């Protein structure tokens, strides 16, 4: 966690609050100490205390995964971690509690296209304000090194040829 995205994580939990409250005044949400959901009131004006805060939390933790391992790859990095983790929550509590098979409970490569849309959308939230901040970030000519690599192969056939031929 890095100083300076340390205090930029902050501003980021600010400005998705302040996107959420642009959606939650277009819905109608009022504050109010009474906790509900058909009368439209709730405290933090349905995110609770603990709620407001659930997204914020893991973006440190999608900071450190980012320096622990271009752009739409890293897109695709963060939505297979952010289902991952998800996975193995209920992986772990259902092993726990002895329920039922989840569908979800395969590899990542083979879900339904909306179960990667639901993360990758987060994963694009979370991006796009890296994307501004001037944070260029990676995954961390090709042809001719490509071709190049071909000719040292060839170079080592032909030294295996010449063997040959000698022979």
């Not at 914020?56 to 271009?70: F, Q």
């Not at 509690?97 to 990758?120: I, S």
Request: neutral net charge.
């Amino acid at each position: 966690i890095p100083e300076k995205l340390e205090y930029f994580i902050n501003k980021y939990a600010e400005h998705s609050h302040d996107k959420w409250s642009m959606d939650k005044l277009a819905n109608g949400w009022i504050y109010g100490e009474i906790y509900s959901d058909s009368s439209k009131i709730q405290p933090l004006m349905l995110l609770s205390e603990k709620e407001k805060e659930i997204y914020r939390w893991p973006i440190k933790e999608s900071l450190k995964t980012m320096l622990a391992w271009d752009l739409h790859a890293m897109a695709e990095m963060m939505a297979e971690n952010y289902h991952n983790i998800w996975a193995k929550k209920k992986k772990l509590e259902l092993e726990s509690k002895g329920g039922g098979n989840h569908p979800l409970l395969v590899p990542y490569d083979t879900l339904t296209a909306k179960e990667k849309a639901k993360d990758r959308e987060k994963a694009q939230d979370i991006f796009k304000f890296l994307q501004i901040s001037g944070y260029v970030v990676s995954r961390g000519x090709x042809x001719x090194x490509x071709x190049x690599x071909x000719x040292x192969x060839x170079x080592x056939x032909x030294x295996x040829x010449x063997x040959x031929x000698x022979x």
